[PDB]
Design a protein around this nucleic acid. Sequence first.
RNA 1: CCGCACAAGCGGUGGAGCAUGUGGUUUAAUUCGAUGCAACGCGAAGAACCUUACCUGGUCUUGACAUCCACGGAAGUUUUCAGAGAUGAGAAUGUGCCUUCGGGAACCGUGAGACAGGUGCUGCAUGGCUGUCGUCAGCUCGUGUUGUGAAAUGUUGGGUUAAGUCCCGCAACGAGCGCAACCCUUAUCCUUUGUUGCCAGCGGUCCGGCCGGGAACUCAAAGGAGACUGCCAGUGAUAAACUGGAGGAAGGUGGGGAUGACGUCAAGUCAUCAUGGCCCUUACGACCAGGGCUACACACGUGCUACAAUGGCGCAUACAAAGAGAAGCGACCUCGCGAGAGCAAGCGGACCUCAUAAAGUGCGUCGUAGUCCGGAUUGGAGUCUGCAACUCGACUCCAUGAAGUCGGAAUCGCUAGUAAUCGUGGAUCAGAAUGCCACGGUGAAUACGUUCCCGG
Lengths: 144, 114, 99, 127, 100, 211, 82, 224
Amino acid sequence: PRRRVIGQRKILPDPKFGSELLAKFVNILMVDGKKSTAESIVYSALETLAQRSGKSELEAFEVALENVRPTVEVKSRRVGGSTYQVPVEVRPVRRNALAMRWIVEAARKRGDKSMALRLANELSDAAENKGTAVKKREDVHRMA
Amino acid sequence: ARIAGINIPDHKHAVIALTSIYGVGKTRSKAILAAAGIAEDVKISELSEGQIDTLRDEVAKFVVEGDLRREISMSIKRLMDLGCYRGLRHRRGLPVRGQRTKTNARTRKGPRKP
Amino acid sequence: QRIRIRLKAFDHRLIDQATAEIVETAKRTGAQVRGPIPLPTRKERFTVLISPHVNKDARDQYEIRTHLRLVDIVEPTEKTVDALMRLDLAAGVDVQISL
Amino acid sequence: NQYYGTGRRKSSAARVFIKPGNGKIVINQRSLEQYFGRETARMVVRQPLELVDMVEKLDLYITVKGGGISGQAGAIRHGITRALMEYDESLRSELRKAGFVTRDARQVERKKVGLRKARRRPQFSKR
Amino acid sequence: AKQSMKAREVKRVALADKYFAKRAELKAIISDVNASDEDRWNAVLKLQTLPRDSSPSRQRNRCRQTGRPHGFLRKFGLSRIKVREAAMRGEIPGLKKASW
Amino acid sequence: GQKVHPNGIRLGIVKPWNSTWFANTKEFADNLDSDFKVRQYLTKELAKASVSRIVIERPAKSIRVTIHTARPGIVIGKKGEDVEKLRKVVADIAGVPAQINIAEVRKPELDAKLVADSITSQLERRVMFRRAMKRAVQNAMRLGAKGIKVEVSGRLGGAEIARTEWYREGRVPLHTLRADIDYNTSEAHTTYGVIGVKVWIFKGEILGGMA
Amino acid sequence: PRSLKKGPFIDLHLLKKVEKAVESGDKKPLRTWSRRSTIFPNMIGLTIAVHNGRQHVPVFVTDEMVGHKLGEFAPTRTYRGH
Amino acid sequence: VSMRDMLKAGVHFGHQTRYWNPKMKPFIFGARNKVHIINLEKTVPMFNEALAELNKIASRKGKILFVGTKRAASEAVKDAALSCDQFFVNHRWLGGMLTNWKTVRQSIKRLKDLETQSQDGTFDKLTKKEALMRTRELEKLENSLGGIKDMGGLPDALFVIDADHEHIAIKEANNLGIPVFAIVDTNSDPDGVDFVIPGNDDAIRAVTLYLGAVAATVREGRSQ
RNA sequence: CCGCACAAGCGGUGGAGCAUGUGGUUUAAUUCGAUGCAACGCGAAGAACCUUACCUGGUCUUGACAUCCACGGAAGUUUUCAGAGAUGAGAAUGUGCCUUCGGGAACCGUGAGACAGGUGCUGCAUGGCUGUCGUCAGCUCGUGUUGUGAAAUGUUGGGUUAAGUCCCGCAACGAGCGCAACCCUUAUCCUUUGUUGCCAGCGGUCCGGCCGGGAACUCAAAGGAGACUGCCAGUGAUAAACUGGAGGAAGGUGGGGAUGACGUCAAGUCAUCAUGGCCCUUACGACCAGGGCUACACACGUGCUACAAUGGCGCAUACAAAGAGAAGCGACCUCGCGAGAGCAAGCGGACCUCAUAAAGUGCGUCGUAGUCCGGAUUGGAGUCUGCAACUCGACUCCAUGAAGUCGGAAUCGCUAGUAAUCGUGGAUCAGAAUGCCACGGUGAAUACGUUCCCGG
Ligand SMILES: [Mg+2]
Ligand SMILES: [Mg+2]
Ligand SMILES: [Mg+2]
Ligand SMILES: [Mg+2]
Ligand SMILES: [Mg+2]
Ligand SMILES: [Mg+2]
Ligand SMILES: [Mg+2]
Ligand SMILES: [Mg+2]
Ligand SMILES: [Mg+2]
Ligand SMILES: [Mg+2]
Ligand SMILES: [Mg+2]
Ligand SMILES: [Mg+2]
Ligand SMILES: [Mg+2]
Ligand SMILES: [Mg+2]
Ligand SMILES: [Mg+2]
Ligand SMILES: [Mg+2]
Ligand SMILES: [Mg+2]
Ligand SMILES: [Mg+2]
Ligand SMILES: [Mg+2]
Ligand SMILES: [Mg+2]
Ligand SMILES: [Mg+2]
Ligand SMILES: [Mg+2]
Ligand SMILES: [Mg+2]
Ligand SMILES: [Mg+2]
Ligand SMILES: [Zn+2]
């Protein structure tokens, strides 16, 4: 957008929890438009996360992403005429996506034989501010 | 366990552990198994020798392991001996079946050389 | 007993004119017709290179769409088969008769 | 007794027939679970009845052709919405509010010459 | 192209049509099951005695106005060039620029 | 840049085809071949009748050819003799019962083919081209044409370097499909080389589709 | 491979030449262009000068060569390296 | 118009003493409150003698162009022209309008063609957007040439309000020899007006007085 | 001030294997052309012979192709020998038709020269066609006015647009070419017509729209309606216009296409064709067989398949669109592990056929390994097309199981039904698609912003 700053479109709630954030999560996790595989993975991971965290699995997802959501991040600027880093705050809608993105890549790196398990394990460690998802969040805060 | 031929099969589904032998692949393996009556999902461990000897008997019918290695080597040596086109490309070390050799014939020429 | 008439053309104007004349003359003799029924038209498409030398990207796409109408006369009077034969047919329109 | 709707999504087209009933669904002479093994389709098909909160008052018999599993789900949703509106003509505002009356016009874009896919360009090379 | 090429094409077709019947019958005898392998042998020997330019698989569709051996279109019998002139001039009936 | 053929793009909107017969793919090619050679024969034979367009329409058992000339009495000769002769000739080429029905053009200065071939006939007679093109455009618009553009390209005046010269007057809106823009191209073979002329003649927007 | 229902292939001019050669005894190398013909059992021990496209190279038929085309023994490209 | 008739309307009003033009000294009564006061003793006879010429021109079938581009007084001048069946310019003056008479004729023809086309038909043949666009162009042309569509030949007389504002018009007229009748405030240059009326040109009341008196005398000149 | 130009994102290329093009090298020949963007899956929408322009040899000289002359033979059909074949040498049959009876036409052969022939050179002589900046918003003119004049103005400015789009301003007023609209397609509805398409109510049924039917619905294809900033509010010079709202299937050029201004590059093409000049003419033309265009120490470009668990394999099972078909597509049944074969129905095709979509889904297995990943390569054995698969085809079966474990600097595409992924079809074509051109399925992420990079 040089001329028209177009508004973002709306995502549809998930048919299992009506949660916009869950739908955004599965859209981020999706690969090659295979939505069904992604929803299977996410529901499996959420339910096992529920088993470890007891009640309120959707809420557990909320607090998991909360424990690793970023507040301040470095941003590049060429106004000086040379590359210039600056610490800037992040809008809530964007830090939601950043947290979701960090979670999914971290899960893929985890391995251990199943995406369902990787996602659940990363979420479970995220719920308690651990699993290296928080560490990646902590390092980009330190870079302020 | 021990099966005919020098190689020792590992402990996994028979259809798969049987492929270890140089002369047998997935279809010939299930053929051998069906002929011996043993199912596929069985493992090589937990399999009494009473059927292991039958397996080796039925695999004895087909050419396998060293005898196959000698047979293919004789066939390529004969090809080279005729002096036929394929014989030349075999002793030259080049694609034999008409593949492009101007580029990306690496599988037979080895790594790029200066 | 009935007669099926297939009409092919390259432009819907001509085919509609011809099929209107067919149904009109057939109704005129009193033979009962099944109307003009428009069957799916066919679209041949040709993507041909516009440039004589070295321009694969540059090319144009043409199409020949042929239109197809089907009329049907269930009770053909003997004043009809001769009549439709007498009726003039446009050069563009192609008419096929099948009892 | 009979109320008819016609909904189209992408390449699919669905006829929908609505009668007073206990909430029974049938699609191409099959049950809703017989047809859509995917749960998201199972939910988008029933969304309008949840809106109007009439999920045990109406039995609907529907048939759909063309498109894919999700395309057909959307088509039958747009059909049952039109059927409801022809049945009530006051749920119109609510269904519209939920964006169930729009007949989404999005369709697949044609391939273009010199382009591998619609709005997709072959890889450029510098030197 | 060169008049030699058009002459070659017309000769090839004028021989293929001639020997069509004999070639067909001979190929029949050859591929025919139950055929005595001596008859099949005589047929496969006789086949290569006919002019090699009798096989239809040996012809090449050329532009019926320039003889161009490339960019041919069976529907019109012209190369990819002359079709465009005939079209843009309104000579190919019902042919127009497509758009969808 | 290059421009789409104006006649070839208005076929659907305002321009009729010049061969309106129908045939399926079985005998489509040879129909085209036959009509091509017959119209080229007619052009070669009526190089003085000043023909503009040769439209061809085929009944199932017949070939019908309509000539658009500016000199009807010429092509029909005396008592329709030569026209019957060439009807026999086209019967030979098509191998089919033939019929020829000439048609006249009332404003020969309003025919891109006619004015283009006249320009070329002048050029090959070694006349200064600017005079030719400007005379043509003046005559055309004097006969009430909404617009006309003439274009000549080649070794004009035996130039060592070929130049492009055009002259427009009136309105010639190529981009408007609704426009009745008649266009044709001619070539003149001189000692220096071959010179190409193009003529656009816009005779007014045609409101109300094809018919 | 050609087929089995059609048997091997050979052009009859070479066939006539080879039969006239064998029936007549030892002969000069047969000068042929038919790279497409296949070596039959009868031509064992013969010597065929088969065209490589620029020259007829000699090939002394042995029983091992039976079931192969003649062209397989007349390379058509010269190459030594770079 | 009598001096009392003008004075009540306020014809004596003039632009601030800060803003005046040198040639207007003979026509200026004096100053009050830093305001130029126009002398009606000169204004009344000159206006009467101009009315004589306007009556003469209209009584020899003259075409009269009322000119004024003030946003306040546009409708007044238009109605003034309509009350005597005379042509008028009530919107911003177009540069070289008289000098480019040939150019304007094509615009009038286009305005006439558009109004004729709407009455004749073929709007249905045009696309609904195209027909609406043609109507918008006709409306714009009517806003541009509502007064002079029936001008025919160049006018025989000009009436100008605030001659300084309309200076292009008077320059054109002088270049054509067409006489200029103009209400000339103290800030204007009176050289271009052959029959000059020095008076207020902004005030709606005095402007309407000028227009009504002129139109009454023009109808009188027409009646004979 | 705009532009996927960057940023923000998603997936790539760059590493591997192979496919393909090019440079180079090689070669008897590896035919020619295309070469920064804008050459390099380009001409070529398809090189085994043919194609084919190249090479080697074998052959012809008014000629393979055209007209003209005579002279002699119907034409044509069937075989035989030599030869790799062009070709020679024959040997049988026919020896016809029209004709005012002479002849003519028909072709065939021989001779005579006029001539033909050239994919030989020149795209810096050219026409025609095309690329490109760029679908960019520009390029101009008439009259007027200004200046002594070259010229200027308009076309700049304020705003605003996708836009020289629009409104004001302004000595400019208008116009032309572009922009936009008119065209196609798509999203809603209406009317008309209902078979080969349709099945709601009907009865009837072998449960098959299949048969009585029914004309509703889907759909088909003609005609028509619909969107206009039209309405509302707010903003704004009350302006243009922008923001939001209503209703609406659709809202602000709805989506996509076609459409390419003046010109720029002596850009590309004399090998589509045409063409000025030049050149060749018992050969630079013509015919034939074989070879080559497929080479291989290399280098570059574009692709394909992968490195796996969001996966592989097994079993079960669901939902498309758009096309093609007569020397064609070819069902059914039978045979074969299979490619296929045999038999043979139907269909010039809303009817018959290609042709059962695949991702998906359900169950089971595989447990992170060079693996039940990967499929290269190679051996063996086949099928089919075709005179003919050695050079040099496609495919099947058994066997074999390289590299490869996510790819350096650098670099590319993409703003929504898009990218990504999954299949399907078509052209060319006897056969030969990882290319091309089309079709649908599933279906995202991101865009704060114009400071930098690049092009206008
Ligand atoms: Mg295998
Ligand atoms: Mg069809
Ligand atoms: Mg030629
Ligand atoms: Mg071929
Ligand atoms: Mg173009
Ligand atoms: Mg970026
Ligand atoms: Mg690579
Ligand atoms: Mg090359
Ligand atoms: Mg060249
Ligand atoms: Mg490409
Ligand atoms: Mg050039
Ligand atoms: Mg060049
Ligand atoms: Mg400019
Ligand atoms: Mg501006
Ligand atoms: Mg302006
Ligand atoms: Mg446009
Ligand atoms: Mg709105
Ligand atoms: Mg050049
Ligand atoms: Mg050859
Ligand atoms: Mg090549
Ligand atoms: Mg595998
Ligand atoms: Mg392995
Ligand atoms: Mg691994
Ligand atoms: Mg797609
Ligand atoms: Zn004043």
